[PDB]
Amino acid sequence: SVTPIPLPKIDEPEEYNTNYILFWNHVGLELNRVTHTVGGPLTGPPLSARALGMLHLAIHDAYFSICPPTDFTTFLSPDTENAAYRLPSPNGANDARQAVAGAALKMLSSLYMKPVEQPNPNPGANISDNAYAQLGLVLDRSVLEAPGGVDRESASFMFGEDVADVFFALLNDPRGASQEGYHPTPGRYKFDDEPTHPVVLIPVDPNNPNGPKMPFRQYHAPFYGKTTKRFATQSEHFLADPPGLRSNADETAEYDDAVRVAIAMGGAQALNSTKRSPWQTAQGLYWAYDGSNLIGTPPRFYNQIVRRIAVTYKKEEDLANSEVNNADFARLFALVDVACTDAGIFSWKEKWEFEFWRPLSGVRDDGRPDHGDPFWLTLGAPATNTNDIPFKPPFPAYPSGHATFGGAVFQMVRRYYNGRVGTWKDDEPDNIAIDMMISEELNGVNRDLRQPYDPTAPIEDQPGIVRTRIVRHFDSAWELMFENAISRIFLGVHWRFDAAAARDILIPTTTKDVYAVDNNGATVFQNVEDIRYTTRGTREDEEGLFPIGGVPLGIEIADEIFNNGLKPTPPEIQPM
Numbered sequence: 001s002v003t004p005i006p007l008p009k010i011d012e013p014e015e016y017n018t019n020y021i022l023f024w025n026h027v028g029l030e031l032n033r034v035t036h037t038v039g040g041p042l043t044g045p046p047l048s049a050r051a052l053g054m055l056h057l058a059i060h061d062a063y064f065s066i067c068p069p070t071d072f073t074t075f076l077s078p079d080t081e082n083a084a085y086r087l088p089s090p091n092g093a094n095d096a097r098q099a100v101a102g103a104a105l106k107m108l109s110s111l112y113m114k115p116v117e118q119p120n121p122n123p124g125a126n127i128s129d130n131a132y133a134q135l136g137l138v139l140d141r142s143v144l145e146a147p148g149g150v151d152r153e154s155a156s157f158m159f160g161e162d163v164a165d166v167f168f169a170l171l172n173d174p175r176g177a178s179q180e181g182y183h184p185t186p187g188r189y190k191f192d193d194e195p196t197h198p199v200v201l202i203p204v205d206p207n208n209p210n211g212p213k214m215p216f217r218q219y220h221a222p223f224y225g226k227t228t229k230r231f232a233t234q235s236e237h238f239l240a241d242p243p244g245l246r247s248n249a250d251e252t253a254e255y256d257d258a259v260r261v262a263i264a265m266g267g268a269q270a271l272n273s274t275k276r277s278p279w280q281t282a283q284g285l286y287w288a289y290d291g292s293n294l295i296g297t298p299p300r301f302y303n304q305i306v307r308r309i310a311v312t313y314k315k316e317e318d319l320a321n322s323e324v325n326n327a328d329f330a331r332l333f334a335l336v337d338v339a340c341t342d343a344g345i346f347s348w349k350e351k352w353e354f355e356f357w358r359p360l361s362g363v364r365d366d367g368r369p370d371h372g373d374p375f376w377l378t379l380g381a382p383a384t385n386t387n388d389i390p391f392k393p394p395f396p397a398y399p400s401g402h403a404t405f406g407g408a409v410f411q412m413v414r415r416y417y418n419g420r421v422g423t424w425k426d427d428e429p430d431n432i433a434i435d436m437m438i439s440e441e442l443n444g445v446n447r448d449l450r451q452p453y454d455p456t457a458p459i460e461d462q463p464g465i466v467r468t469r470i471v472r473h474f475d476s477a478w479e480l481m482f483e484n485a486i487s488r489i490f491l492g493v494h495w496r497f498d499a500a501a502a503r504d505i506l507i508p509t510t511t512k513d514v515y516a517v518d519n520n521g522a523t524v525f526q527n528v529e530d531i532r533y534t535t536r537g538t539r540e541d542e543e544g545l546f547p548i549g550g551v552p553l554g555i556e557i558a559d560e561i562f563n564n565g566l567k568p569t570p571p572e573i574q575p576m
Contacts (some may be wrong), residue, residue: 002133006458008294008445010436016311018147018320020097021059021329023057024104026173028055029144030113031294033296034138037455037570038131039114039206041124044220045401047176049299053231053341055107060166060334060566061087062103062160066096069325075334084170085568088162089158095156096326097148102160105150108139110168123175126204130479132214134362147320161217173228182222184355189244191355194392195364196377220395225349230569232338232561237346239553240410240537240546242356242398242497247540253513254502258495259371261360261515261523263508268377273521276490278378282470284490285382285403286439290323290393293385293453295440298402299340302409305480306336308434309413313421314485331518335566339558347401347559348494349549354374356398360458360493365421384467385459387449392493399550400498406484407554415562426559428478431528444469452556470558479528485551487526501535 002412007030016022027414034049035041036453042051065087076087078090093099112134115125143150151157184192195201213568243251243258270283276284287299310329316322359378366372380390395401414430422431440446449464474480486505488494496502507516518522534550536545547553 002130003456004136004137004436005034005134005455007033008459010304012307013311015319016307016566019325019329021326021333022307022310023145023147024055024059024063024100025052025303025329025333027104027138028052028108029110029296029300030134030138030142031046031133032300033294035133036291036296036569037132037293038134040081040127040131040135040414041300043297044177045291045297045299046221046224046348047173049337049340049344049405050068050173050176051111051128051172052303052369053113054167054298055080056334057171057231057329058103058107058160058164059100060330061167062099063163063326063330065090065097065163066156066290067204067327069327074332075217075566075568079187082134082571083432084166085523085571088159088335090156090159092455093154093156093159095154096323098151098154098156099160099163100152100330101146101150102152102157103164104160106137106161107168108403110164110172111135112139119174121371122178122270124177126202126206131206139281144533152166162540171229171231173224174223176446177221178223179219182218184220188367189242189357189362191357191396192465193356193363194360194394194439196360196571197391206320214560218392218394222395225345226350227575228345229574230345231341232564232566233342233346233557233569234560234564234567234573235551236573238539238542239350239399240548241539242354242495243353244545245356246376246555247436247538251513254497256371257514258497258502259262259359259366260364261378261489261496262492263373263488264517264521265523266359266378268379271377273373273376275517277522280490280522282442282468283440284379284487285467286470286472287484287487288382288384288439288441288491290381290383292383292460294446295384298405299337299344301439302340302405303333303337306332306409306413308437309417310431313417313432313435313446314483317349327351332416335407338566339408339412339554340405342561343404343557344401345553346553347399347404350399350553351401352397353432354398355396358392358397359492360392362495377488380407381491381493382441383448383465384446385449386432386453387451387464397494398498399553400485400488400494402488402552403485403494403550404554404557405498405550407482407551408558409554410481410484411555411558412562414477427532430442430478431477432477433455433475437472437474438469439472442467442470447547467556476528478531480533481554482499482528482550497549499549500533500551501537503535
């Protein structure tokens, strides 16, 4: 019926998919890259992080209900009075593999299916039939590839579906990405449509892509962070005001030097003002995953990394028949994807609260003859596998989503493995090393096309400039967290403070708020082993000191969720 989209191969040992927990995670990752190629539901970083959080929460409770855990307990309980938080009982269901298949298939089905349930009122509607159809093939195909098979008649399978229904009804946010009613408010420091993509022409009818097109200005999920239900956070999280705003509107020396670093470190490859090296250029793209064709969003890459970590530090050698491994993975992925979801929530809530402008507009519209550059261009977020030019993500700058996602994901890995892989203070560098780690942005396969992407052909048969294959090894999760964060400074899409306080990451000079630069004028960073996220800042509306940028925010969301043992956010503190 539908011509299936030819997907490129994943750089991962085939062995990983013999484990059913990893297998379903993988299916969730395939839907992520496919939905970003076809323009289906749950696109964008915050909502694609939530889809994975939901999938793993459903998997967690189906598994641990059938194979009860020792310390922790299920996220939801069977004896809870509140029906919405009431986990179905097994009553004879004893097959964990089928329970997981059931929870996984039901959740993903609900998330990516054609919303024939009437309530498809533009919540995020403008998805073609082909998009739904392409995603349906991924789902149908997975049933057949699942290790050990799928038995829909099984009791255990039906129990899993029950679990999925509960989590879906409780956590689904259909209109989370609604833009309705939002319009930028220009002025210094304020977010507005980026100047290289001021408007995009989208078809009037998605089903008819070669017909009429209309003007469209995109503002990604302006109301999400404020209104959506949180997952496992036990409090609301806040960041210090960014330099130039509110209580910090007097941090002009910081702001000025930030403009300077932005130019030298994040400009286009060929500009005379760009001081970034070839290796730093590789660090910027490696961590991209900016919603591209065949690639998807950042949560996808972070999960690709955690899969490697999981298998590398597994307790038992058998990936296929080991409950010790199955429980370790079901647990890790739940903690990690839940932290990722909530990090997406709070980074987006802070992004739209401050509405801080991206560096491209900040540098072009600075207004001062000796500070700005009305013609500056950034290396930009890469439009991989398209013949489009780089772009600036369609949402405010402060704090960085990449830094926040990364601070949460990797701090969660660190807490989980402390004492197991090595020993460290929870706030100092770990020992979690990985190697042979390849990013799809730099794999010798993906590329920058010279003509529009052809969905009926494998990218290998499409002319374009092929991205160099770079194989990395990292020494710790502290390095991952740091590099993932500064990568955005090299792409030129984030200010230094969107990642973390400049003091904690840059080498100081005798001049306050001004940092060290080498011979060729490039910014020099602190050694990863020495980095400590301690600099706090003030807020105009609240008393106390608060973290600065995304990494410290992600770190705090992860510690809270872990310290509380993966427990639902009290309903009394969810948005009104």
